[PDB]
Short mmCIF file of C-alpha atoms and ligand atoms in Angstrom, two decimals:
data_model
loop_
_atom_site.label_atom_id
_atom_site.label_comp_id
_atom_site.label_asym_id
_atom_site.label_seq_id
_atom_site.Cartn_x
_atom_site.Cartn_y
_atom_site.Cartn_z
CA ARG A 6 0.00 0.00 0.00
CA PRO A 7 1.31 3.50 -0.93
CA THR A 8 1.66 6.59 1.34
CA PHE A 9 -1.17 9.19 0.81
CA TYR A 10 -1.35 12.99 1.57
CA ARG A 11 -4.38 15.25 2.43
CA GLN A 12 -5.21 18.54 0.54
CA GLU A 13 -8.07 21.16 0.44
CA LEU A 14 -8.66 22.14 -3.27
CA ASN A 15 -11.80 24.35 -3.77
CA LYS A 16 -13.13 23.32 -0.28
CA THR A 17 -12.64 19.65 -1.52
CA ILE A 18 -10.59 17.08 0.55
CA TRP A 19 -8.07 15.37 -1.87
CA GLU A 20 -6.21 12.31 -0.44
CA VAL A 21 -3.92 10.62 -3.09
CA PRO A 22 -0.70 8.55 -3.17
CA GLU A 23 2.39 10.83 -3.10
CA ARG A 24 3.45 9.56 -6.61
CA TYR A 25 0.68 11.99 -7.88
CA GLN A 26 2.05 15.56 -7.27
CA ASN A 27 1.05 19.13 -8.38
CA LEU A 28 -2.71 18.39 -8.20
CA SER A 29 -4.34 21.40 -10.00
CA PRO A 30 -8.15 21.69 -10.50
CA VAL A 31 -9.18 21.48 -14.24
CA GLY A 32 -12.44 22.00 -16.20
CA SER A 33 -13.56 25.21 -14.35
CA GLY A 34 -15.77 22.89 -12.17
CA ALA A 35 -18.16 21.63 -14.91
CA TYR A 36 -16.20 18.28 -15.35
CA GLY A 37 -16.85 17.30 -11.67
CA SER A 38 -13.98 16.98 -9.11
CA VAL A 39 -10.94 16.61 -11.46
CA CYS A 40 -7.27 17.54 -10.90
CA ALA A 41 -4.36 17.60 -13.33
CA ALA A 42 -1.48 15.76 -11.55
CA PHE A 43 2.15 14.72 -12.41
CA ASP A 44 2.69 10.92 -12.30
CA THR A 45 6.17 10.82 -10.70
CA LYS A 46 6.40 7.05 -11.46
CA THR A 47 6.28 7.77 -15.27
CA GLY A 48 6.77 11.60 -15.44
CA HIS A 49 3.62 12.14 -17.60
CA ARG A 50 0.73 14.47 -16.61
CA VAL A 51 -2.53 12.63 -15.57
CA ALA A 52 -6.17 13.33 -14.60
CA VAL A 53 -7.34 12.35 -11.08
CA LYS A 54 -11.16 12.36 -10.67
CA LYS A 55 -12.44 11.91 -7.07
CA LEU A 56 -15.91 10.28 -7.49
CA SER A 57 -18.64 12.57 -6.04
CA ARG A 58 -21.10 11.18 -3.35
CA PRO A 59 -20.28 7.67 -4.64
CA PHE A 60 -22.38 5.51 -2.19
CA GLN A 61 -25.15 8.10 -1.46
CA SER A 62 -27.98 5.94 -2.97
CA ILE A 63 -28.53 2.53 -4.70
CA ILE A 64 -28.42 4.43 -8.08
CA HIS A 65 -25.11 6.30 -7.24
CA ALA A 66 -23.60 3.09 -5.70
CA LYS A 67 -24.49 0.94 -8.77
CA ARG A 68 -23.33 3.81 -11.09
CA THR A 69 -19.98 4.05 -9.26
CA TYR A 70 -19.63 0.26 -9.89
CA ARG A 71 -20.61 0.31 -13.63
CA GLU A 72 -18.06 3.09 -14.30
CA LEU A 73 -15.13 1.28 -12.63
CA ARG A 74 -16.28 -2.02 -14.26
CA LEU A 75 -16.36 -0.22 -17.65
CA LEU A 76 -13.04 1.67 -17.32
CA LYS A 77 -11.27 -1.59 -16.19
CA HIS A 78 -12.57 -3.33 -19.37
CA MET A 79 -11.57 -0.71 -22.05
CA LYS A 80 -8.13 -1.86 -23.33
CA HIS A 81 -8.26 -0.16 -26.83
CA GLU A 82 -6.35 2.75 -28.54
CA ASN A 83 -9.50 4.84 -29.42
CA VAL A 84 -11.30 4.37 -26.03
CA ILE A 85 -10.34 5.87 -22.59
CA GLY A 86 -8.46 3.41 -20.31
CA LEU A 87 -7.77 3.37 -16.54
CA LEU A 88 -4.12 3.92 -15.49
CA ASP A 89 -5.08 3.73 -11.77
CA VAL A 90 -8.07 3.47 -9.34
CA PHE A 91 -7.45 4.10 -5.59
CA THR A 92 -9.06 4.77 -2.18
CA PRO A 93 -7.36 6.07 0.99
CA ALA A 94 -9.56 3.47 2.88
CA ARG A 95 -7.43 0.77 4.66
CA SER A 96 -10.65 -1.42 4.71
CA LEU A 97 -14.27 -1.89 3.43
CA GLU A 98 -15.50 -0.60 6.86
CA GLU A 99 -14.06 2.88 5.87
CA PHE A 100 -14.54 2.86 2.04
CA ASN A 101 -16.34 6.15 1.00
CA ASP A 102 -14.03 7.90 -1.58
CA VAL A 103 -13.02 6.50 -5.05
CA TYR A 104 -10.36 8.15 -7.29
CA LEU A 105 -9.88 7.29 -11.03
CA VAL A 106 -6.65 8.07 -12.98
CA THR A 107 -6.61 8.48 -16.83
CA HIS A 108 -4.43 10.35 -19.40
CA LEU A 109 -4.96 14.13 -19.06
CA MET A 110 -6.95 15.49 -22.05
CA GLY A 111 -5.16 18.21 -24.10
CA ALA A 112 -8.11 19.01 -26.43
CA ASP A 113 -11.67 17.73 -27.01
CA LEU A 114 -12.78 17.55 -30.70
CA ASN A 115 -14.64 20.89 -30.08
CA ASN A 116 -11.33 22.69 -29.24
CA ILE A 117 -9.71 21.17 -32.39
CA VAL A 118 -12.41 22.66 -34.73
CA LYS A 119 -12.05 26.15 -33.03
CA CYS A 120 -8.22 25.88 -33.62
CA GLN A 121 -8.10 24.71 -37.33
CA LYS A 122 -10.22 24.15 -40.53
CA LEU A 123 -10.04 20.28 -40.97
CA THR A 124 -9.18 18.61 -44.34
CA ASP A 125 -10.67 15.35 -45.73
CA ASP A 126 -7.43 13.58 -44.59
CA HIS A 127 -8.35 14.71 -41.01
CA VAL A 128 -12.07 13.82 -41.25
CA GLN A 129 -11.24 10.30 -42.66
CA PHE A 130 -8.69 9.61 -39.86
CA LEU A 131 -10.83 11.04 -37.01
CA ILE A 132 -14.04 9.19 -38.07
CA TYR A 133 -12.03 5.99 -38.78
CA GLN A 134 -10.81 6.14 -35.11
CA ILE A 135 -14.34 6.79 -33.63
CA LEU A 136 -15.76 3.84 -35.67
CA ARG A 137 -12.82 1.66 -34.54
CA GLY A 138 -13.48 2.54 -30.83
CA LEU A 139 -17.25 1.94 -31.38
CA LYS A 140 -16.54 -1.47 -33.02
CA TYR A 141 -14.72 -2.52 -29.76
CA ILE A 142 -17.44 -1.01 -27.43
CA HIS A 143 -20.37 -2.48 -29.46
CA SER A 144 -18.68 -5.97 -29.37
CA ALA A 145 -18.97 -5.87 -25.50
CA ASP A 146 -22.76 -5.01 -25.80
CA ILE A 147 -21.87 -1.44 -24.58
CA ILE A 148 -23.69 1.53 -26.19
CA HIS A 149 -22.19 5.00 -25.59
CA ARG A 150 -25.65 6.74 -25.87
CA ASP A 151 -24.05 10.27 -25.54
CA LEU A 152 -21.48 10.48 -28.42
CA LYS A 153 -20.69 14.20 -28.93
CA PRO A 154 -17.60 16.34 -29.69
CA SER A 155 -16.89 17.19 -25.95
CA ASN A 156 -16.60 13.36 -25.27
CA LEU A 157 -13.95 12.97 -28.00
CA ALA A 158 -10.32 13.60 -26.88
CA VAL A 159 -7.82 14.32 -29.72
CA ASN A 160 -3.97 14.62 -29.33
CA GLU A 161 -1.08 16.40 -31.20
CA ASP A 162 -1.09 13.49 -33.80
CA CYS A 163 -4.91 13.86 -34.26
CA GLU A 164 -5.16 10.49 -32.38
CA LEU A 165 -8.58 10.14 -30.70
CA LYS A 166 -10.07 8.51 -27.57
CA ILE A 167 -13.83 8.02 -26.95
CA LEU A 168 -14.86 8.77 -23.33
CA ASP A 169 -17.98 9.94 -21.34
CA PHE A 170 -17.56 12.95 -18.95
CA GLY A 171 -21.30 12.70 -17.94
CA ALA A 185 -25.18 19.68 -26.39
CA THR A 186 -26.18 15.92 -26.23
CA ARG A 187 -29.50 16.94 -28.00
CA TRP A 188 -27.82 17.80 -31.42
CA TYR A 189 -26.20 14.31 -31.81
CA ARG A 190 -28.98 12.10 -30.30
CA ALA A 191 -30.65 9.44 -32.57
CA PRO A 192 -34.34 10.24 -33.28
CA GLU A 193 -35.72 6.93 -31.73
CA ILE A 194 -34.40 8.23 -28.33
CA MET A 195 -36.02 11.72 -28.57
CA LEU A 196 -39.32 9.93 -29.45
CA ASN A 197 -38.89 7.40 -26.56
CA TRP A 198 -39.44 4.29 -28.78
CA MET A 199 -38.96 0.83 -27.09
CA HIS A 200 -36.36 -0.68 -29.54
CA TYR A 201 -32.76 0.55 -29.00
CA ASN A 202 -29.66 -0.80 -30.87
CA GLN A 203 -25.93 0.20 -30.87
CA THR A 204 -26.50 2.23 -34.09
CA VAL A 205 -27.79 5.14 -31.90
CA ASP A 206 -24.00 5.86 -31.71
CA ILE A 207 -23.66 5.64 -35.55
CA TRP A 208 -26.36 8.38 -35.85
CA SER A 209 -24.16 10.52 -33.55
CA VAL A 210 -21.00 9.77 -35.67
CA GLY A 211 -23.07 10.93 -38.69
CA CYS A 212 -23.99 14.19 -36.88
CA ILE A 213 -20.33 14.69 -35.79
CA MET A 214 -18.85 13.97 -39.28
CA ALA A 215 -21.37 16.35 -40.95
CA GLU A 216 -20.21 19.05 -38.43
CA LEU A 217 -16.54 18.32 -39.41
CA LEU A 218 -17.46 18.57 -43.14
CA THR A 219 -19.84 21.63 -42.98
CA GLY A 220 -18.38 23.33 -39.85
CA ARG A 221 -21.98 23.86 -38.51
CA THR A 222 -24.41 21.86 -36.31
CA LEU A 223 -26.40 19.68 -38.76
CA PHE A 224 -29.62 19.57 -36.55
CA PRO A 225 -29.31 22.73 -34.38
CA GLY A 226 -32.75 22.23 -32.67
CA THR A 227 -34.05 24.87 -30.14
CA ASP A 228 -35.99 21.99 -28.42
CA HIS A 229 -36.41 18.21 -29.05
CA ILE A 230 -39.55 18.90 -31.19
CA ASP A 231 -37.61 21.50 -33.31
CA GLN A 232 -34.71 18.95 -33.49
CA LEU A 233 -37.02 16.15 -34.84
CA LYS A 234 -38.37 18.57 -37.55
CA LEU A 235 -34.78 19.45 -38.71
CA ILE A 236 -34.03 15.68 -38.88
CA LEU A 237 -37.23 14.57 -40.71
CA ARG A 238 -36.96 17.29 -43.45
CA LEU A 239 -33.44 15.90 -44.27
CA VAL A 240 -33.90 12.06 -43.82
CA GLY A 241 -37.48 11.97 -45.30
CA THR A 242 -41.07 11.45 -44.03
CA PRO A 243 -40.90 7.95 -42.42
CA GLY A 244 -41.10 5.12 -45.01
CA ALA A 245 -43.81 2.40 -45.11
CA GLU A 246 -40.99 0.08 -43.75
CA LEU A 247 -40.38 2.27 -40.61
CA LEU A 248 -44.03 3.13 -39.70
CA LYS A 249 -44.69 -0.69 -39.81
CA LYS A 250 -42.53 -0.87 -36.61
CA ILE A 251 -44.29 1.85 -34.46
CA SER A 252 -47.01 0.39 -32.13
CA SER A 253 -48.99 3.47 -30.88
CA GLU A 254 -51.41 5.18 -33.33
CA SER A 255 -50.48 8.29 -31.21
CA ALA A 256 -46.70 7.91 -31.94
CA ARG A 257 -47.19 7.13 -35.69
CA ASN A 258 -49.48 10.24 -36.09
CA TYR A 259 -46.89 12.38 -34.19
CA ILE A 260 -43.86 11.21 -36.25
CA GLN A 261 -45.70 11.93 -39.57
CA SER A 262 -47.15 15.16 -37.94
CA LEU A 263 -43.54 16.50 -37.39
CA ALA A 264 -42.61 15.55 -41.02
CA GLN A 265 -44.56 18.53 -42.52
CA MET A 266 -41.49 20.76 -43.20
CA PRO A 267 -40.72 20.81 -46.99
CA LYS A 268 -38.20 17.93 -47.60
CA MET A 269 -34.48 18.86 -48.18
CA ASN A 270 -31.93 17.37 -50.66
CA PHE A 271 -29.24 15.35 -48.76
CA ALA A 272 -26.17 15.99 -51.04
CA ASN A 273 -27.18 19.73 -51.34
CA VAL A 274 -26.53 20.07 -47.56
CA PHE A 275 -22.87 18.87 -48.15
CA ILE A 276 -21.99 20.55 -51.54
CA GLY A 277 -18.14 20.58 -51.55
CA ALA A 278 -17.70 17.38 -49.45
CA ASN A 279 -15.94 14.23 -50.81
CA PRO A 280 -18.83 12.22 -52.38
CA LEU A 281 -17.48 9.07 -50.60
CA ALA A 282 -18.04 11.04 -47.32
CA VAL A 283 -21.66 11.98 -48.33
CA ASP A 284 -22.18 8.29 -49.33
CA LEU A 285 -21.10 7.25 -45.79
CA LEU A 286 -23.19 10.00 -44.06
CA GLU A 287 -26.23 8.66 -46.00
CA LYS A 288 -25.76 5.15 -44.43
CA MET A 289 -25.32 6.68 -40.92
CA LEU A 290 -28.18 9.25 -40.83
CA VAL A 291 -30.91 6.60 -41.55
CA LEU A 292 -34.27 7.02 -39.68
CA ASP A 293 -34.78 3.20 -39.52
CA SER A 294 -32.10 2.00 -37.03
CA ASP A 295 -32.57 -1.59 -38.43
CA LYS A 296 -31.23 -0.23 -41.80
CA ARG A 297 -28.53 2.16 -40.34
CA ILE A 298 -24.91 0.87 -40.94
CA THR A 299 -22.83 -0.72 -38.06
CA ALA A 300 -19.37 0.48 -36.86
CA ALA A 301 -17.77 -2.71 -38.32
CA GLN A 302 -19.45 -2.17 -41.77
CA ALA A 303 -18.56 1.59 -41.67
CA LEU A 304 -14.81 0.68 -41.29
CA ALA A 305 -15.06 -1.26 -44.64
CA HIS A 306 -16.53 1.85 -46.40
CA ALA A 307 -14.36 3.19 -49.29
CA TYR A 308 -13.95 6.64 -47.61
CA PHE A 309 -11.51 4.82 -45.16
CA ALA A 310 -9.43 3.20 -47.99
CA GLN A 311 -6.29 5.04 -46.63
CA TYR A 312 -6.63 3.62 -43.05
CA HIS A 313 -8.94 0.54 -42.97
CA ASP A 314 -6.88 -2.54 -41.88
CA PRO A 315 -9.23 -5.42 -40.82
CA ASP A 316 -6.53 -7.39 -38.87
CA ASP A 317 -6.14 -4.18 -36.71
CA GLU A 318 -9.84 -3.42 -35.83
CA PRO A 319 -10.35 -5.76 -32.85
CA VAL A 320 -13.49 -6.52 -30.80
CA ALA A 321 -13.45 -6.40 -26.95
CA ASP A 322 -13.16 -9.41 -24.56
CA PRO A 323 -16.37 -10.80 -22.94
CA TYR A 324 -17.81 -8.09 -20.61
CA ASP A 325 -19.94 -9.46 -17.70
CA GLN A 326 -22.84 -6.92 -17.73
CA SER A 327 -25.08 -9.20 -15.54
CA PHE A 328 -24.88 -6.66 -12.65
CA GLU A 329 -26.96 -4.27 -14.87
CA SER A 330 -30.13 -6.36 -14.14
CA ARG A 331 -29.57 -6.52 -10.31
CA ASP A 332 -31.59 -4.59 -7.62
CA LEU A 333 -28.96 -4.67 -4.72
CA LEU A 334 -28.25 -2.66 -1.49
CA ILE A 335 -25.54 0.09 -1.18
CA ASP A 336 -23.38 -2.28 0.96
CA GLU A 337 -23.49 -4.93 -1.86
CA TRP A 338 -22.62 -2.23 -4.52
CA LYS A 339 -19.98 -0.65 -2.22
CA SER A 340 -18.51 -4.16 -1.58
CA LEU A 341 -18.46 -5.19 -5.27
CA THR A 342 -16.77 -1.76 -5.92
CA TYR A 343 -14.02 -2.42 -3.22
CA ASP A 344 -13.35 -5.93 -4.72
CA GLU A 345 -12.71 -4.18 -8.09
CA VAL A 346 -10.50 -1.36 -6.61
CA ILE A 347 -8.23 -3.68 -4.54
CA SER A 348 -7.94 -6.19 -7.47
CA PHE A 349 -6.94 -3.57 -10.16
CA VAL A 350 -3.67 -4.27 -12.11
CA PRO A 351 -2.18 -1.20 -13.89
CA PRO A 352 -1.52 -1.42 -17.67
CA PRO A 353 2.20 -1.80 -18.60
CA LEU A 354 4.42 1.28 -19.52
C1 TJZ B 401 -24.17 5.20 -17.17
S1 TJZ B 401 -23.41 5.98 -15.80
O1 TJZ B 401 -24.44 6.57 -14.99
O2 TJZ B 401 -22.52 5.05 -15.19
N1 TJZ B 401 -22.51 7.20 -16.39
C2 TJZ B 401 -22.80 8.55 -15.88
C3 TJZ B 401 -22.15 9.62 -16.75
C4 TJZ B 401 -20.65 9.37 -16.85
C5 TJZ B 401 -20.37 7.99 -17.41
N2 TJZ B 401 -18.93 7.72 -17.43
C6 TJZ B 401 -18.41 6.51 -17.64
O3 TJZ B 401 -18.87 5.48 -17.15
C7 TJZ B 401 -17.16 6.46 -18.52
C8 TJZ B 401 -16.67 5.04 -18.75
C9 TJZ B 401 -17.55 4.30 -19.75
C10 TJZ B 401 -17.00 4.14 -21.17
C11 TJZ B 401 -16.41 5.44 -21.72
C12 TJZ B 401 -15.92 5.27 -23.16
C13 TJZ B 401 -17.03 4.80 -24.05
C14 TJZ B 401 -17.59 3.49 -23.56
C15 TJZ B 401 -18.08 3.63 -22.12
N3 TJZ B 401 -16.14 7.25 -17.86
C16 TJZ B 401 -15.28 8.00 -18.55
O4 TJZ B 401 -15.31 8.08 -19.77
C17 TJZ B 401 -14.28 8.76 -17.75
C18 TJZ B 401 -13.73 9.94 -18.24
C19 TJZ B 401 -12.79 10.64 -17.50
C20 TJZ B 401 -12.38 10.19 -16.26
C21 TJZ B 401 -11.30 10.90 -15.49
N4 TJZ B 401 -10.55 11.81 -16.33
C22 TJZ B 401 -10.96 13.05 -16.58
N5 TJZ B 401 -12.10 13.47 -16.01
C23 TJZ B 401 -12.44 14.74 -16.22
N6 TJZ B 401 -11.79 15.69 -16.90
C24 TJZ B 401 -10.67 15.24 -17.46
C25 TJZ B 401 -10.18 13.94 -17.38
C26 TJZ B 401 -9.00 13.95 -18.17
N7 TJZ B 401 -8.77 15.14 -18.67
N8 TJZ B 401 -9.79 15.96 -18.22
C27 TJZ B 401 -9.77 17.34 -18.56
C28 TJZ B 401 -10.95 18.09 -18.51
C29 TJZ B 401 -10.94 19.42 -18.90
C30 TJZ B 401 -9.76 20.01 -19.33
C31 TJZ B 401 -8.59 19.27 -19.36
C32 TJZ B 401 -8.59 17.94 -18.97
C33 TJZ B 401 -12.94 9.02 -15.76
C34 TJZ B 401 -13.88 8.32 -16.49
C35 TJZ B 401 -21.07 6.94 -16.56
#
């Protein structure tokens, strides 16, 4: 067990191993309780996040568990990984505080776009990397559900990591804003479509004042729902609403991206599909011709089996808090 040290940072008690020095608060608050540190073991900068009110309720307890269970699983170049998870607690009796260590983020994809006007070489490479990360995540039966530029970290090499820091609206698949039952991984693909369009056009594709405004901007671009789609909505009320919000004059798809590489527009067209059963998968996307320059199949792995069975459980804080401790004590850092 390592030696820890106390610290007040913005009226917040920060106890960490001494290997993590120069803790400095980052994200102006909005990213939760996060500090930039210096990993003295490796001499790189890192992010320490102290988890906030982690065992307050069943929901918070179970959510603390899922996160640690997820971070510990992600061993892929285009997805966030865990360098370190620690607690000051010398026992389960005392366990209340959880700290997570990751690479420090230099820029989100948002910052990138503010900095520079991206080329088609950039857009190919960036989207290739998101779809690669998604192929891995999807293989483990994990859906991101909140893919957006602020959750995409991008380095000096334009190398990219998918993460979730916790406007979502702009990038959200339409089935979710209509609260339909059926939900597949391709909700993420919709988001990649929205993100890619933004990288091509430099503007929010569906900049919707509210969710109803959003759904109008979508349906005028991706068409009044087809016979095929409507034949999969159950409620008369829902079907009448969906076709009721598709009363904006229809728009021409390729018109919206005049100037873009046609191979890009071709790909966008297979991502921004109303019918999620007919929307392309991450693994198919990787084989699209727009990624000729990068797409290597032998180098686009799937994840290992991910035990998600805890998702279905109604347990007590002390079960959640105990399963969490198990996972903290038993963590094995990645190699350097
Ligand atoms: C459903 S739920 O309810 O469980 N759900 C609630 C909302 C938050 C969700 N988070 C996660 O479950 C994911 C892990 C799940 C994976 C993520 C990848 C896709 C597949 C699923 N967790 C993460 O992705 C994460 C991110 C950062 C950290 C710590 N690291 C930083 N935390 C803040 N800020 C930072 C840094 C680094 N740099 N910066 C930074 C910020 C600003 C400026 C400079 C640097 C820790 C964890 C969980």
